[PDB]
Design a protein around this motif. Structure first.
Motif, PDB file in Angstrom:
ATOM      1  N   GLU A 255      -6.384  11.384  -6.438  1.00 46.65           N
ATOM      2  CA  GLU A 255      -7.272  10.676  -7.345  1.00 46.65           C
ATOM      3  C   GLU A 255      -6.666   9.326  -7.681  1.00 46.65           C
ATOM      4  O   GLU A 255      -5.450   9.138  -7.575  1.00 46.65           O
ATOM      5  CB  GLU A 255      -7.505  11.479  -8.634  1.00 46.65           C
ATOM      6  CG  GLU A 255      -7.749  12.956  -8.402  1.00 46.65           C
ATOM      7  CD  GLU A 255      -8.253  13.666  -9.639  1.00 46.65           C
ATOM      8  OE1 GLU A 255      -8.479  12.993 -10.666  1.00 46.65           O
ATOM      9  OE2 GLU A 255      -8.429  14.901  -9.581  1.00 46.65           O
ATOM     10  N   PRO A 256      -7.490   8.354  -8.075  1.00 46.12           N
ATOM     11  CA  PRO A 256      -6.948   7.054  -8.481  1.00 46.12           C
ATOM     12  C   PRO A 256      -6.036   7.178  -9.693  1.00 46.12           C
ATOM     13  O   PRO A 256      -6.248   8.014 -10.575  1.00 46.12           O
ATOM     14  CB  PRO A 256      -8.199   6.234  -8.809  1.00 46.12           C
ATOM     15  CG  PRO A 256      -9.286   6.871  -8.031  1.00 46.12           C
ATOM     16  CD  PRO A 256      -8.957   8.330  -7.951  1.00 46.12           C
ATOM     17  N   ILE A 257      -5.013   6.331  -9.729  1.00 45.70           N
ATOM     18  CA  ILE A 257      -4.070   6.313 -10.842  1.00 45.70           C
ATOM     19  C   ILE A 257      -4.671   5.498 -11.979  1.00 45.70           C
ATOM     20  O   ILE A 257      -5.024   4.328 -11.797  1.00 45.70           O
ATOM     21  CB  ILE A 257      -2.712   5.740 -10.414  1.00 45.70           C
ATOM     22  CG1 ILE A 257      -2.116   6.556  -9.268  1.00 45.70           C
ATOM     23  CG2 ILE A 257      -1.753   5.701 -11.592  1.00 45.70           C
ATOM     24  CD1 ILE A 257      -0.809   6.003  -8.749  1.00 45.70           C
TER      25      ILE A 257
ATOM     26  N   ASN B 124      -3.621   9.692 -16.383  1.00 44.35           N
ATOM     27  CA  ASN B 124      -2.632  10.510 -15.694  1.00 44.35           C
ATOM     28  C   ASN B 124      -1.295   9.799 -15.523  1.00 44.35           C
ATOM     29  O   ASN B 124      -0.415  10.322 -14.833  1.00 44.35           O
ATOM     30  CB  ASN B 124      -3.165  10.956 -14.326  1.00 44.35           C
ATOM     31  CG  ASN B 124      -3.822   9.828 -13.558  1.00 44.35           C
ATOM     32  OD1 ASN B 124      -3.252   8.750 -13.407  1.00 44.35           O
ATOM     33  ND2 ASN B 124      -5.024  10.073 -13.061  1.00 44.35           N
ATOM     34  N   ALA B 125      -1.119   8.630 -16.130  1.00 47.24           N
ATOM     35  CA  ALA B 125       0.132   7.892 -16.068  1.00 47.24           C
ATOM     36  C   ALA B 125       0.588   7.544 -17.476  1.00 47.24           C
ATOM     37  O   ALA B 125      -0.228   7.319 -18.371  1.00 47.24           O
ATOM     38  CB  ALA B 125      -0.009   6.613 -15.236  1.00 47.24           C
TER      39      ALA B 125
ATOM     40  N   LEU C 240      -1.782  -2.886  -6.593  1.00 53.23           N
ATOM     41  CA  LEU C 240      -1.172  -2.394  -7.848  1.00 53.23           C
ATOM     42  C   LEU C 240      -2.188  -1.522  -8.578  1.00 53.23           C
ATOM     43  O   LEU C 240      -3.367  -1.905  -8.637  1.00 53.23           O
ATOM     44  CB  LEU C 240      -0.798  -3.611  -8.696  1.00 53.23           C
ATOM     45  CG  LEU C 240       0.606  -4.170  -8.476  1.00 53.23           C
ATOM     46  CD1 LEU C 240       0.747  -5.537  -9.124  1.00 53.23           C
ATOM     47  CD2 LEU C 240       1.653  -3.219  -9.025  1.00 53.23           C
ATOM     48  N   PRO C 241      -1.769  -0.370  -9.141  1.00 51.45           N
ATOM     49  CA  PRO C 241      -2.674   0.508  -9.864  1.00 51.45           C
ATOM     50  C   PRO C 241      -3.106  -0.217 -11.143  1.00 51.45           C
ATOM     51  O   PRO C 241      -2.386  -1.070 -11.605  1.00 51.45           O
ATOM     52  CB  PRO C 241      -1.803   1.721 -10.206  1.00 51.45           C
ATOM     53  CG  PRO C 241      -0.638   1.638  -9.257  1.00 51.45           C
ATOM     54  CD  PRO C 241      -0.408   0.156  -9.079  1.00 51.45           C
TER      55      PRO C 241
END
Ligand SMILES: *[C@@H]1O[C@H](CO)[C@@H](O)[C@H](O)[C@H]1NC(C)=O
Ligand SMILES: *[C@@H]1O[C@H](CO)[C@@H](O)[C@H](O)[C@H]1NC(C)=O
Lengths: 33, 33
Positions: free
Chosen positions: B4-6, B10-11, B27-28
């Motif tokens: 899944e995309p960051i 979730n970060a 870059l996320p």
């Protein structure tokens, strides 16, 4: 013991409290608009 | 396993480390200014 700059990596947002210091100078980036 | 995309869901922000990857491309969203 190691003094480091205050960032969002080690600070979290909380609600107002009367024990909390009221800062008007050298505001950390979390507390800076 | 499901890639899944960051995002900030979730970060979490942590302090600098030498075993962390150094990203200059794609870059996320949490790491863009
Ligand atoms: C900070 O502000 C609150 C609200 O005015 C006050 O009650 C408190 O005495 C102030 N002082 C500190 C540094 O706690
Ligand atoms: C990321 O860059 C730093 C230099 O700022 C270096 O110390 C580190 O080894 C690099 N990390 C990786 C795994 O590429």
């Amino acid at each position: 013991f190691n003094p480091e700059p205050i960032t969002m990596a080690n600070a979290r947002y909380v609600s107002q409290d009367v024990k909390f210091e009221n800062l008007t100078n050298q505001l950390p980036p979390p507390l800076l608009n």
